[PDB]
Design an enzyme around this catalytic site. Structure first.
Site, PDB file in Angstrom:
ATOM      1  N   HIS A  47       0.800  -1.210   0.000  1.00  0.00           N
ATOM      2  CA  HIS A  47       0.000   0.000   0.000  1.00  0.00           C
ATOM      3  C   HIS A  47       0.844   1.277   0.000  1.00  0.00           C
ATOM      4  O   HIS A  47       0.385   2.303  -0.472  1.00  0.00           O
ATOM      5  CB  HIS A  47      -1.064  -0.051   1.103  1.00  0.00           C
ATOM      6  CG  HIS A  47      -2.149  -1.041   0.822  1.00  0.00           C
ATOM      7  ND1 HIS A  47      -3.478  -0.684   0.676  1.00  0.00           N
ATOM      8  CD2 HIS A  47      -2.100  -2.383   0.601  1.00  0.00           C
ATOM      9  CE1 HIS A  47      -4.197  -1.762   0.411  1.00  0.00           C
ATOM     10  NE2 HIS A  47      -3.380  -2.809   0.356  1.00  0.00           N
ATOM     11  N   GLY A  66       5.878   6.400  -4.726  1.00  0.00           N
ATOM     12  CA  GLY A  66       6.131   4.996  -4.416  1.00  0.00           C
ATOM     13  C   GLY A  66       6.590   4.755  -2.984  1.00  0.00           C
ATOM     14  O   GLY A  66       6.235   5.525  -2.066  1.00  0.00           O
ATOM     15  N   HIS A 175       0.044 -13.825  -0.518  1.00  0.00           N
ATOM     16  CA  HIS A 175      -1.273 -14.195  -0.024  1.00  0.00           C
ATOM     17  C   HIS A 175      -1.296 -15.489   0.726  1.00  0.00           C
ATOM     18  O   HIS A 175      -2.296 -15.826   1.390  1.00  0.00           O
ATOM     19  CB  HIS A 175      -2.306 -14.160  -1.127  1.00  0.00           C
ATOM     20  CG  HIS A 175      -2.775 -12.775  -1.415  1.00  0.00           C
ATOM     21  ND1 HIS A 175      -3.936 -12.494  -2.069  1.00  0.00           N
ATOM     22  CD2 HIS A 175      -2.212 -11.585  -1.072  1.00  0.00           C
ATOM     23  CE1 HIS A 175      -4.086 -11.172  -2.142  1.00  0.00           C
ATOM     24  NE2 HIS A 175      -3.041 -10.615  -1.565  1.00  0.00           N
ATOM     25  N   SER A 176      -0.166 -16.181   0.628  1.00  0.00           N
ATOM     26  CA  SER A 176       0.086 -17.404   1.348  1.00  0.00           C
ATOM     27  C   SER A 176       0.115 -17.118   2.836  1.00  0.00           C
ATOM     28  O   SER A 176      -0.077 -17.987   3.712  1.00  0.00           O
ATOM     29  CB  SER A 176       1.443 -17.919   0.901  1.00  0.00           C
ATOM     30  OG  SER A 176       1.341 -19.246   0.459  1.00  0.00           O
ATOM     31  N   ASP A 193      -5.245 -18.739   2.447  1.00  0.00           N
ATOM     32  CA  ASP A 193      -5.007 -20.175   2.296  1.00  0.00           C
ATOM     33  C   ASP A 193      -4.918 -20.968   3.605  1.00  0.00           C
ATOM     34  O   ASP A 193      -5.056 -20.398   4.706  1.00  0.00           O
ATOM     35  CB  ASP A 193      -3.899 -20.505   1.282  1.00  0.00           C
ATOM     36  CG  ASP A 193      -2.485 -20.444   1.870  1.00  0.00           C
ATOM     37  OD1 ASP A 193      -2.236 -19.594   2.745  1.00  0.00           O
ATOM     38  OD2 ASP A 193      -1.622 -21.245   1.413  1.00  0.00           O
ATOM     39  N   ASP A 200       4.150 -20.978   1.469  1.00  0.00           N
ATOM     40  CA  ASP A 200       4.113 -22.148   0.587  1.00  0.00           C
ATOM     41  C   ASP A 200       3.167 -21.944  -0.600  1.00  0.00           C
ATOM     42  O   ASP A 200       2.505 -20.903  -0.695  1.00  0.00           O
ATOM     43  CB  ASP A 200       3.768 -23.433   1.381  1.00  0.00           C
ATOM     44  CG  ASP A 200       2.422 -23.358   2.106  1.00  0.00           C
ATOM     45  OD1 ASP A 200       1.530 -22.642   1.625  1.00  0.00           O
ATOM     46  OD2 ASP A 200       2.235 -24.060   3.131  1.00  0.00           O
TER      47      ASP A 200
END
Ligand code: HEM
Ligand SMILES: [Ca+2]
Ligand SMILES: [Ca+2]
Length: 336
Positions: A47, A66, A175-176, A193, A200
């Site tokens: 973000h 940035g 996102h793991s 997940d 992983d």
């Protein structure tokens, strides 16, 4: 150069980060755990970094700085972006920390993400450069991709920033080690997940499973159906897993789980330095710990079979991966 606690840095200016490292691993990441505060933290790198539009710049318009820590410097402005909901929590924790060590906010945010991800099982060891200015301007709105944005629009947002489609998939490896709080507050902490503290390929697998469950009492803007109880699923991720622009790389992290960490390190190192000149920063990657944990074999969940896989590539068949044994254990939320 010589740093505290008998430690060494090739560059003297990196020496402060060793004491920063001690502070956050204790007083933020709880003895270096890969939990909520690491998850938030890692999400916070994005973000801050993604507030960067060269397309806006080319048109005599400010396009964001940035990785400049502006999300922290101008938290009041930036975190009240709808794309930035739930973000003010980890900003307001990090802010007093970065003050005591007098490190710049941009440096700090990239540091916490690099540190915390190292806490994750089979986690990555992200490059960490330092010396970002603590003087900037707030990011213009609508720069952060939304989980209800189309793939086409998401690709174009990240391409603008600097990323080719392969790299977006790589970045999403984050996102793991992830859950949501604001799509459905009543499901807050349910992970994307089955193994939110391991780094992983389970995210890439479970994203290709058919959505079969409505975990809350209803669905929400940006949320689709889950393949498993306890699990949340983002619309954007479901799409990207199946989109023909992205499906094959999505699958590449499954057929080759070893490629996930180094590919994610490369792309993160770009991201940590959007709006920055690496040649104007010093290399303090040394401070960032070496992650523990072997690359795990990706598995199909209990109750699932290859028939549940919406295979979406094209050049390469889905890999024959084994199914877990037993009945499926509903997935526990990430701790408070
Ligand atoms: C490409 C577009 C992306 C979209 C649309 C997206 C979307 C989302 C959404 C909706 C959430 C749940 C937030 C909530 O309501 O609590 C989330 C969580 C998260 N995201 Fe992404 N994301 C993107 C890219 C990234 C990138 C590039 C990273 C890091 C490299 C990242 C890291 C994370 C992490 C670590 C979490 C977990 C936060 C927590 O568990 O508290 N995301 N993302
Ligand atoms: Ca920023
Ligand atoms: Ca995982």
């Amino acid at each position: 150069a010589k740093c505290s606690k008998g430690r060494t840095a090739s560059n003297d200016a990196c020496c402060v980060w060793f004491d920063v490292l001690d502070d956050i691993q204790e007083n933020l990441f709880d003895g270096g755990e890969c939990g909520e505060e690491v998850h938030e933290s890692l999400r916070l790198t994005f973000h801050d970094a993604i507030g960067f539009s060269p397309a806006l710049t080319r048109q005599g318009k400010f396009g964001g700085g940035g990785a400049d820590g502006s999300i922290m410097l101008f938290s009041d402005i930036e975190t009240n972006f709808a794309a930035n909901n739930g973000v003010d929590d980890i900003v307001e924790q990090q802010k007093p920390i970065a003050i005591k060590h007098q490190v710049s906010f941009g440096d700090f945010i990239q540091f916490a993400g690099a540190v915390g991800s190292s806490n994750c099982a089979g986690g990555p060891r992200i490059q960490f450069l330092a010396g970002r200015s603590n003087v900037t301007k707030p990011s213009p709105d609508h720069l952060v991709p939304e989980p209800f944005d189309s793939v086409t629009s998401i690709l174009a947002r990240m391409g603008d920033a600097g990323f080719k489609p392969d790299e977006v998939v790589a970045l999403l490896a984050s996102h793991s080690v992830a859950a949501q709080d604001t799509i459905d507050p009543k499901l807050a902490g349910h992970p994307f997940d089955s193994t939110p503290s391991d780094f992983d390929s389970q995210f890439f697998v479970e994203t290709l499973l058919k959505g079969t469950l409505i975990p809350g009492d209803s669905l929400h803007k940006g949320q689709v159906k889950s393949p498993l109880p306890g699990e949340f699923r983002l619309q954007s991720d479901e799409l990207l897993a199946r989109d023909s622009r992205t499906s094959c790389e999505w699958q590449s992290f499954i057929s080759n789980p070893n490629s996930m960490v180094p590919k994610f390190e490369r792309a993160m190192a770009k991201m940590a330095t959007l709006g920055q000149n690496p040649k104007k920063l010093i290399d303090c990657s040394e401070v960032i710990p070496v992650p523990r944990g072997r690359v795990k074999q990706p598995t199909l969940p209990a109750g699932k079979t290859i028939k549940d896989i919406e295979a979406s590539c094209r050049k390469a068949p889905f890999p024959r991966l084994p199914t877990d044994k037993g009945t499926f254990t509903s997935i526990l939320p990430v701790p408070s």
